[PDB]
Design a protein around this ligand. Structure first.
Ligand code: MD1
Ligand code: PCI
Ligand code: SF4
Ligand code: SF4
Ligand code: 6MO
Lengths: 509, 1244, 217
């Protein structure tokens, strides 16, 4: 029993408008450098599709995540320690730049400096950002399949179409599309950490963010393969790997992430989750993969239970963090209402970024239809997005939790319509799904109104505990190069000292 | 020492966890500052974007290392009510990428000039000390003028200086004004709401010198002619927050999540409130993904569905089981109870004009504007002329309201709807029907061009002796929809499955949407509207408004909303969202932009007619007014080319002109003095004698075409320019890619109002100046490029239709390199102008024509018929049957002083708009303390305007929307007209004054104003028409009510008096060229649609690398899998698209969500990035508008008639484009034309 | 020749050896961000599996042999192993090396994103490997281990700081002189190249607990 805190994220896919604002703001701030210009910490994919990098969901090809041996023990699909080491001179599974897209630029200057007397209007052609050579034609991009862009036979190669008869969906009338914005999962049992030989990747104790130490990373590039979600990107110029850092610089002060605060859809939720670190192995190594979901919900602790509260305090969790957990929207959607579900729980990483499945227009029927259990509003059965598809994506293939989520969402709508249109109280749909009037009005508050102060409940990382805040406040930022940051031993070959430190010790004790 | 630390290996090991699966290390983490220091910045500045998107989102500009690095949304908007979601964060992906521009390789850093023009300018100045003359030496020479006009779009830019270009520009303008007239100088800049002051900078300079300001709302086709038609209002809609008040919504031709991004959450969240959503799009669009039902009718056929639904509604909620709410509503707010006179035909009658109080004997007591007041019957048979009709707006006060009272006795008198149950006899009236016509790509339903219905009528004794028959609009409406009322009509339906005039079964054939689906939604929509008292809404966009018959598509949707009494009801109504046209502080901005504080009036021009003519696109017209004529119209009365109708409308004072007169307007005064008569009467006489002609009649005589054009905040020649190839050939005089012949080469019939000549005049424009921060397509084809400042480097204001906040644009840093703000550029030009014009122009007298203005007194021009003074059908009475003729004084040498100061007219005359006028002196006193005043000179003592802020402050102080003091005087002025008290709509905000620095700190909500019909309260959201319905304020229409029947002559004869399905027209731009220049690959004719793109706002951001990387990396076209596979086109293949008008090249996007039969090139991807050479034209591939062409509609030219009177952006021809067909085919040779040697070849 | 003899074999080996240690130490303390293997596989996967494995597996054979061979079963035996065992590793390394060099120079992406230090070092190694394989036919003339005795004698004198090490060499063929020179030069250029990745060989991973968590600090 080791209680730890982490700020989880829940994205309401029902409200996602496939706009990509989240991706652009992240790109502007974190990855506009040469070397990671092709990396999209946050990226959105239109589904059906093979995503970015192409077919990242195909673990048979890419080798990501964990597998459970026959003896019940956990091992990276890449191989045990020795196996992984034997693949170091050349990652036989490593995805190539082409699997992403060759980053390109344009010669806008030609528009400007085009000489006098051109036989044809000048133009800006594409240039490779890797080679710098002229590009014959742009043939791929990170969001190339956006909005069903591409033959059905090509998109339907989506791994989530397995065990589904997909013929019927190539028919115009049955067309369906949804968006899947994604960042790094910040797993509880991250495979990346387990696949890095140099041990440069780690999970932060205070907020559970997983970071790749740029000083320590040696560029063995095995981590990129270990990550089943393919969210670690090799920086081809620096030689080290880089990944979404969960905007720790803002989260530390208690602010939302950039992609959270900038989400035009108001679909992202940030809240604290308390989990039992000691249960991690147990949960992730459960025999049936269809259990990983439930098994993970069991690692999360109730922030209101004084038993948990007392243990959290005993375990180093600041009081503000605990209070934040107590009003966390992530906890309400994953634990209470059961609307949020993990992304690909079958990788056994215990992902920390969950999703609320999307609703969709009713499917095509012979006639104009009838009034179902929810009146003019839809019945879960009539939804056009095949639920099995959503389950291969959110619940390792089990349609039960997905349907419960969809049905409650629909349940709420029906209850809310009676109240605001008929002016009556009708809980018939809520009883059928197991919700109360109270839980519904709250669901409504958080999902419909979604005030800023409700979508984001992020506590400070308390950068003052176990450290020396005062001298830091006074001397941080002055980067003249003292050559003493990064080590705990004061001795250094350049005969120098830390600027943000006190070297004249008190003699008065 | 990091090296020595490794020796503390074991010492840093803490406890394990998870039974040996994890290890807690106590290692150094200082390396983490790496990302921390990246996020840290110098400061954040607030600002928004000056682009046409309606977003108007406040952003945080992050400055780091003295450079703008990135940006995120501001989340501090004043929160909405507790029950409605708040706006934050708003924004979109496009906006989030703006920062990329500031230092990108495509940033315009210095004023540029075309090398050939510079070489000849510098040699001309070495021979002509004076600049005007140096310009004359170049322009008046053919070989010279030609040399730089053919260089356009052909490289050769060289760095210049503000000094050199300002002189050349001022020189060129002086020459042009002194030798042809001020109206030969124009400027095109759109949507002022997105940067009120940046637009105003050019508009002001041009107005001061008498130049013309070209419109945009109609030019872009964002203007829904139906709005003016039905409400006499340009556009007024509820705010996005209001959507959350609706319990039923239909997104019709509106890709909300993609084109209204920042507001999309109101739509996704209202779903959780129990609201049902329906998406109506032919393709599976993003909007579909967020709805409960998806209907995919055939594109263009939408009016069909609308008619059928209107049918079901009228049948089940107005006839069978009536609705108390619906009935009272239409009774009190529509013209349905109004009487229509029946004309005579052969065995049948036809709907004529509406019955006016003047027709009756006693004239109904109404002796003031009797011919302008409608009539109806009360519940007691007694006839009456109820209050509200446009007849009471002028010449009297206290009766222009929607109170249900008798216009004569001022008594409570209920009006009656149907005559049925009191009709003397049953007349048979003929209605037109076009559902049977159309091209081969749309289904048709043969019935009869004319449908006879049995209408209940009454015979009345007209005051002039004779007698005629009358019937209510309500009756004709039920007849028009085909509702069987028991008189046994053969053309009326007996069941919904009966295929008659507008039934579900009927529309299923035309649209392809199951009849049951239509019946259901119509029933649900109407039911909801009943249960909630109008809380049903329809969000419509360019999906419908960009078709030649946008009017029908809209009136279709509008009648539905009215039959359910949704308009003027919070949570219901007509939500028209296209461009950002709601510049809220209207009346405080107009005097600034058009210098109405100094001179009156200014030269406004409707762009469509303007370009149609000067771009000479009329010389290729395929559509004939004849084929638009109603079957019941006298064909011989409407002969001539479409442009002939425009010219007539212009001389009848209906639409504006530019250039106005075929003679320099600055000289008319100098000739009227010698002739001994005053300038006005000397012009009326000369126009009658034909000594002075309207320039429109002779557009190519060498003196009636524009010569100087300023383009700013627009990419005209690369985006909005319909007929791109025609503009390149005629306005620019450069190589073009037009494929067809003209009326002359085909031997078609020439216009009967305009001179024809075989060889059209090319290169009309002498000087084209474009102001931009990036090198756009327009810039590439300009003569002089002025580097303007980005939105993050200048101060300005922004407002939108979606919300009531007026936030700013600010400078995070000073403009980079040699850039300047639009305002500083025009100020400098006004300065250089004032000194270069010395000895050429002095204090001149100018004659200015002005069309009969809407909202003015003159809008009651021609009440009963259409008299052309030129055909002798009446006298030339300016202001009534011809344009007004104004005398404007211009102190050319004082241009710069006036530009930089608030003129005296605000104090002398006053200020106002939309019919009312108030005193604004106290505001000027306040403005003298804020902006300070001029020390001396011509503007001594007047408030200053040296900076953008001074200007912004002028706008905020004079506008009733941002100054509660003015807001009270504004509601007072309107209370005079209505006779009802409205001051209570602003009283409790009277001490409210918005300041520029106040909104820089936090966006502020505006004050309720008569300029709009929605309210700014804390209990009810802003809903269009709310005032009309809740304040009994009339709609600026003929009847004062919502017009369902258009009785104007031209309307009746063009079959538009009542809504009727009108299939998509045939432009005939494919059959004459398909197969001609074969390349070996199959070609096919597809409907070319251009909805707005996801990776740019029009063409802005289209060159932006973030947008290009998130898209396909350049221009692309979407095709269905069938169409593609049938042409042998794989995804991303280079393809060609073309027709009579031109050709464009792009890569293909093959997708299942595109229905067979259509192709889509999302609007604006322009002509500067990733475009190979065309095989059809042998030139750089063209743009999407390289295959479109302007084609005007007559009904869009009606002027001088109440709600159908002119107004800048209010009415006028629109530039529709969705009816276009193109030829698609895979390319073979991919030639880049750059001499690089990197060309490709596609096989098969 | 006597001056150039005591130089290259009694002095140069201490210069390169000092620059190698202090150089590594300094770049480790002040160049963490520059301390990586610098993979190039992502930019061009083609032929990398074969090439890199050949090169590394071979070069490693030689290292174990060189290390235990000159820093530690009779002499003539050891020599037979070096020629057959190490001779094979050398053929693999040389082939992989040549393949990697062909790639780095003519493969568009790899060549466009490369640094000179990477072409230099790779080239020298390929040469030092070819130079090495050429010593085999020379050692052959002395299957008794006479030559090897001199070389190992020289090496061990240097590493223990016994002066006059160039004496042990008296006699050895010229080819060996070269190999010993170019070879040490690599120890000089070591700290200023990518070779630093060697110091980081991930051995500790075989015994590491899978999950890592860092406490507040
Ligand atoms: N991202 C972005 N946002 C912007 C703009 C931009 O350039 N980019 N521009 C502004 C401006 S100025 C305008 S005028 C609007 O955005 C136009 O958007 P709207 O969604 O109404 O039009 P559109 O022409 O795109 O049509 C919307 C969808 O309707 C479908 N459609 C097209 N034709 C038809 C039709 O004939 N009938 C019906 N029922 N639907 C049709 C189609 O799915 C299209 O995407 C607005 N915001
Ligand atoms: O250099 C040597 C190499 Cl390479 C091998 Cl393999 C052996 Cl065994 C010995 Cl002894 C020496 Cl010296
Ligand atoms: S910003 Fe929000 S709504 Fe837009 S794509 Fe990202 S997650 Fe979806
Ligand atoms: S471009 Fe328009 S919609 Fe997008 S963020 Fe800027 S203002 Fe908002
Ligand atoms: Mo528009």
């Amino acid at each position: 029993m080791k209680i730890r805190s982490q700020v989880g994220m829940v994205l309401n896919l029902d409200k996602c408008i496939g706009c990509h604002t989240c991706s652009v703001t992240c790109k502007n701030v974190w990855t506009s450098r040469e070397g990671v210009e092709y990396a999209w910490f946050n990226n959105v994919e239109t589904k059906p599709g093979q995503g970015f990098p192409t077919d990242w969901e195909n673990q048979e090809k890419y080798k990501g995540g964990w597998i459970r041996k026959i003896n019940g023990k956990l091992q990276p699909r890449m191989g045990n320690r020795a196996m992984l080491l034997g693949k170091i001179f050349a990652n036989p599974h490593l995805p190539g730049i082409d699997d992403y897209y060759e980053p390109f630029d344009f010669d806008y200057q030609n528009l400007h400096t085009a000489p006098e007397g051109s036989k044809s209007q000048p133009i800006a052609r594409p240039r490779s950002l890797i080679t710098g050579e002229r590009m014959a034609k742009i043939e791929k991009g990170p969001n190339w399949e956006d909005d069903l862009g591409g033959e059905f036979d090509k998109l339907a190669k989506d791994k989530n179409f397995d065990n589904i008869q997909k013929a019927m969906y190539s028919q115009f009338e049955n067309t369906f599309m949804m968006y899947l914005p994604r960042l790094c999962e910040h797993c509880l049992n991250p495979a990346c950490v387990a696949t890095c030989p140099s041990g440069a990747i780690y999970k932060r104790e205070e907020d559970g963010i997983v970071l790749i130490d740029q000083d320590k990373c040696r560029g063995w590039r095995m981590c990129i393969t270990g990550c089943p979600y393919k969210k670690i990107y090799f920086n081809w110029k620096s030689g080290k790997s880089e990944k979404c850092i969960f905007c720790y610089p803002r989260i530390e002060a208690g602010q939302p992430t950039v992609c959270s605060e900038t989400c035009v859809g108001r679909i992202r939720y940030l809240g604290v989750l308390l989990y039992d670190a000691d249960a991690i192995e147990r949960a992730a190594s459960t025999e049936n993969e269809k259990d990983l979901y439930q098994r993970q919900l069991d690692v999360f602790l109730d922030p209101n239970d004084p038993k948990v509260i007392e243990q959290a305090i005993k375990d180093g969790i600041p009081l503000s963090v605990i209070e934040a957990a107590q009003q966390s929207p992530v906890y309400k959607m994953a634990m209470e209402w059961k609307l949020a579900l993990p992304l690909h729980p079958e990788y056994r990483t215990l992902p920390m970024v969950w999703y609320v499945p999307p609703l969709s227009p009713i499917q095509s029927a012979a006639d104009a239809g009838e009034l179902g259990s929810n009146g003019i509003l839809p019945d879960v059965e009539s939804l056009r997005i095949p639920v099995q598809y959503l389950a291969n994506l959110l619940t390792a293939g089990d349609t039960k939790p997905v349907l419960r989520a969809l049905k409650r969402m629909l349940a709420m709508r029906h209850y809310k319509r009676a109240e605001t249109v008929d002016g009556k109280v009708d809980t018939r749909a809520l009883e059928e799904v197991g919700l109360t009037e109270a839980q519904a009005q709250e669901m409504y508050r958080y999902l419909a109104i979604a005030n800023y102060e409700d979508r984001f409940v992020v506590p400070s990382s308390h950068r003052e505990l176990a450290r020396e805040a005062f001298p830091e406040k006074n001397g941080c930022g002055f980067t003249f190069g003292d050559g003493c940051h990064g080590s705990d031993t004061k001795f250094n070959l350049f005969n120098s000292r830390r600027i943000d430190a006190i070297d004249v010790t008190s003699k008065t004790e | 020492s990091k090296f020595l630390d490794r020796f503390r290996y074991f010492k840093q090991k803490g406890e394990t966890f998870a039974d040996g699966h994890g290890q807690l290390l106590n290692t150094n983490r200082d390396w983490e500052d790496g990302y921390r220091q990246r996020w840290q910045h110098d400061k954040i500045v607030r600002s928004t974007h000056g682009v046409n998107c309606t977003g108007s989102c406040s952003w945080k500009i992050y400055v780091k290392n003295g450079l703008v690095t990135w940006e995120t949304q501001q989340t501090d908007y004043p929160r909405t009510r507790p029950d409605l979601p708040n706006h934050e964060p708003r924004g979109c992906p496009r906006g989030a990428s703006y920062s990329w521009y500031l230092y990108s390789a495509n940033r315009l850093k210095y004023p540029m000039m075309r090398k050939r023009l510079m070489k000849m300018w510098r040699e001309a100045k070495a021979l002509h000390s004076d600049p005007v003359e140096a310009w004359a030496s170049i322009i008046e020479d053919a070989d010279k003028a030609k040399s730089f006009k053919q260089a356009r779009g052909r490289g050769g830019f060289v760095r210049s200086s503000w000094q050199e270009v300002n002189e050349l520009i001022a020189a060129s303008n002086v020459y042009t004004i002194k030798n042809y007239g001020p109206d030969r100088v124009a400027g095109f800049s759109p949507i002022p709401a997105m940067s009120m002051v940046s637009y105003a900078s050019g508009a002001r300079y041009l107005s001061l010198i008498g130049g013309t300001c070209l419109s945009f709302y109609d030019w872009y086709c964002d203007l829904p002619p139906a709005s003016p038609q039905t409400w006499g209002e340009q556009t007024d809609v509820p705010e996005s927050a209001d959507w959350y008040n609706s319990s039923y919504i239909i997104a019709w031709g509106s890709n909300v999540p993609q084109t209204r991004t920042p507001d999309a959450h109101f739509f996704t969240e209202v779903r959780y409130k129990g609201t049902k959503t329906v998406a109506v799009t032919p393709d599976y669009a993003e909007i579909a993904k967020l709805c409960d039902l998806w209907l995919a009718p055939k594109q263009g056929t939408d009016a069909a569905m609308a008619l059928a639904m209107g049918h079901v509604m009228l049948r089940e909620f107005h006839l069978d089981n009536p609705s108390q709410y619906f009935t009272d509503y239409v009774r009190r707010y529509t013209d349905m109870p109004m009487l229509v006179m029946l004309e005579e035909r052969d065995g049948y009658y036809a709907a004529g004009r509406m019955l006016r109080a003047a027709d009756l004997v006693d004239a109904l007591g109404q002796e003031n504007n009797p011919e302008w007041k409608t009539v109806a019957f009360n519940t007691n048979g007694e006839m009456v002329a109820p209050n509200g009709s446009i007849g009471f707006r002028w010449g009297e006060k206290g009766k222009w309201n929607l109170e249900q009272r008798d216009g004569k006795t001022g008594e409570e008198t209920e009006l009656q709807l149907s005559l049925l149950g009191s009709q003397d006899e049953i007349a048979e009236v003929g209605f037109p029907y076009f559902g049977g016509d159309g091209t081969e790509h749309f289904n048709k339903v043969e019935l009869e061009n004319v449908l006879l219905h049995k209408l209940p009528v009454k015979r009345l004794q007209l005051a002039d002796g004779s007698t005629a028959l009358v019937t209510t609009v309500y009756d004709l409406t039920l007849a028009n929809y085909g509702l069987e009322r028991g008189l046994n009509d053969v053309n009326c339906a007996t069941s919904y499955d009966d295929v008659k005039a507008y039934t579900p079964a009927w529309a299923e054939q035309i649209t392809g949407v199951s009849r049951s689906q239509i019946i259901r939604i119509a029933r649900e929509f109407a039911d909801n509207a009943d249960k909630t008292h109008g809380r049903s809404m329809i969000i419509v966009g360019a999906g419908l408004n960009h078709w030649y018959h946008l009017d029908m598509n809209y009136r279709g949707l509008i009648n539905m909303l009215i039959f359910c009494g949704c308009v003027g009801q919070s949570g219901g109504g007509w939500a028209h969202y296209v461009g950002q046209e709601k510049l809220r502080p209207q009346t405080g901005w107009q005097p600034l932009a058009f210098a109405l504080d100094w001179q009156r009036p200014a030269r406004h021009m409707n762009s469509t007619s303007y370009f149609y003519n000067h771009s000479s696109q009329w010389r290729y017209e395929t559509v004939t007014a004849e084929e638009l004529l109603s079957p019941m119209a006298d064909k011989s009365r409407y002969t001539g080319h479409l442009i002939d109708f425009n010219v007539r409308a212009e001389r009848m004072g209906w639409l504006p002109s530019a250039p106005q007169l075929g003679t320099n307007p600055l000289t008319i005064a100098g000739e009227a003095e010698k002739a001994g008569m005053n300038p006005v009467d000397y012009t009326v006489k000369s126009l009658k004698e034909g000594s002075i002609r309207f320039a429109a009649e002779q557009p190519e005589n060498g003196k009636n075409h524009p010569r100087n054009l300023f383009i700013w905040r627009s990419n005209l020649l690369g985006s909005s320019g319909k007929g791109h190839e025609f503009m390149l050939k005629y306005l620019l005089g450069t190589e073009h890619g037009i494929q067809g012949k003209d009326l002359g080469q085909q031997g078609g019939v020439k216009p009967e109002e305009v001179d024809w000549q075989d060889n059209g005049l090319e290169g009309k424009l002498d000087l084209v100046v474009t102001l931009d921060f990036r090198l756009s397509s327009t810039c590439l084809y300009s003569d002089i490029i002025l580097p303007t400042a980005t939105w993050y480097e200048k101060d300005d204001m922004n407002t939108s239709d979606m919300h009531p906040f007026i936030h700013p644009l600010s400078a995070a840093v000073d403009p980079a390199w040699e850039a300047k703000s639009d305002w500083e550029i025009y100020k400098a030009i006004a300065k250089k102008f004032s000194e270069v014009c010395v000895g050429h122009l002095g204090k001149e007298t100018d004659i200015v024509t002005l069309p009969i203005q809407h909202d003015s007194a003159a809008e009651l021009a021609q009440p009963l018929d259409v008299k052309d003074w030129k055909k002798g059908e009446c006298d030339l009475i300016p202001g009534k049957t011809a344009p007004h003729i104004m005398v404007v004084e211009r102190d050319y040498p004082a241009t710069y002083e006036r530009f930089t100061s608030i003129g005296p007219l605000m104090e002398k005359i006053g200020n106002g708009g939309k019919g009312i006028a108030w005193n604004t002196q106290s505001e000027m006193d306040l403005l003298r303390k804020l902006n300070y005043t001029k020390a001396e000179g011509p503007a001594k003592g007047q408030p200053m305007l040296n900076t953008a802020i001074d200007a912004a402050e002028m706008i905020l102080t004079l506008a009733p929307e941002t100054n509660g003091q003015v807001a009270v005087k504004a509601w007072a002025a309107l209370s005079e007209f209505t006779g009802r008290d409205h001051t209570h709509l602003a009283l409790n905000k009277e001490d409210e004054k918005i300041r520029f620095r106040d909104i820089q700190a936090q966006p502020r909500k505006i004050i309720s104003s008569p300029t709009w019909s929605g309210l700014e309260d804390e209990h009810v959201s802003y809903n269009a028409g709310y005032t009309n319905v809740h304040e009994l304020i009339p709609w600026r229409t003929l009847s004062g009510r919502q017009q369902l029947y258009q009785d104007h002559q031209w309307m009746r004869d063009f079959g538009e008096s009542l809504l009727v399905y009108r299939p998509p027209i045939d432009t005939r731009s494919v059959k004459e060229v398909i197969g001609q220049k074969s390349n070996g690959n199959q070609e096919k004719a597809l409907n070319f649609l251009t909805p707005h793109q996801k990776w740019g706002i029009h063409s802005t951001y289209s060159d932006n690398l973030l947008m290009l990387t998130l898209g396909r990396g350049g221009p692309v076209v979407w095709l269905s899998e069938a169409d593609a596979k049938d042409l042998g086109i794989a995804d991303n293949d280079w393809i060609e698209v073309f027709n009579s008008n031109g050709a464009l090249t792009a890569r293909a996007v093959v997708s299942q969500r595109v229905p067979a039969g259509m192709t889509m090139m999302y609007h604006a991807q322009e002509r500067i990035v990733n475009l190979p050479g065309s095989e059809i034209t042998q030139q750089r591939g063209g743009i999407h508008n390289s295959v479109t062409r302007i084609t005007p509609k007559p009904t869009h030219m009606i002027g001088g008639y109440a709600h159908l009177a002119y107004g800048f952006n209010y009415y006028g021809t629109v530039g529709s484009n969705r009816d276009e067909f193109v030829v698609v085919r895979k390319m073979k040779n991919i030639d880049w034309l750059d001499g690089e040697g990197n060309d490709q070849v596609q096989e098969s | 020749m006597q001056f150039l003899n005591m130089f290259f074999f009694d002095i140069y080996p201490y210069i390169a050896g000092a620059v190698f240690l202090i150089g590594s130490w300094l770049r480790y303390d002040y160049g963490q961000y520059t301390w990586r293997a610098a993979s190039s596989q992502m930019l061009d996967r083609k032929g990398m599996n074969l090439a890199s494995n050949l090169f590394h597996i071979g070069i490693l054979g030689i290292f174990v042999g060189h290390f235990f061979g000159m820093l530690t079963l009779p002499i003539e035996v050891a020599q037979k192993m070096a020629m057959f065992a190490g001779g094979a590793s050398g053929v693999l390394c040389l082939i992989g090396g040549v393949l990697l060099l062909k790639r780095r120079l003519f493969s568009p992406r790899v060549r466009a994103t490369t640094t000179g230090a990477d072409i230099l070092i790779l080239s020298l190694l390929v040469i030092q490997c070819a130079l090495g394989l050429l010593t085999i036919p020379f050692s052959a003339q002395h299957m008794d281990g006479s030559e090897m005795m001199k070389l190992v004698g020289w090496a061990q004198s240097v590493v223990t700081f016994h002066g006059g090490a160039s004496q042990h060499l008296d006699g050895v063929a010229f080819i060996f002189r070269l190999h010993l020179v170019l070879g040490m030069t690599l120890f000089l250029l070591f700290p200023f190249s990518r070779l630093i990745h060697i110091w980081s060989v991930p051995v500790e991973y075989l015994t590491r607990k899978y999950q890592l968590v860092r406490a507040r600090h």
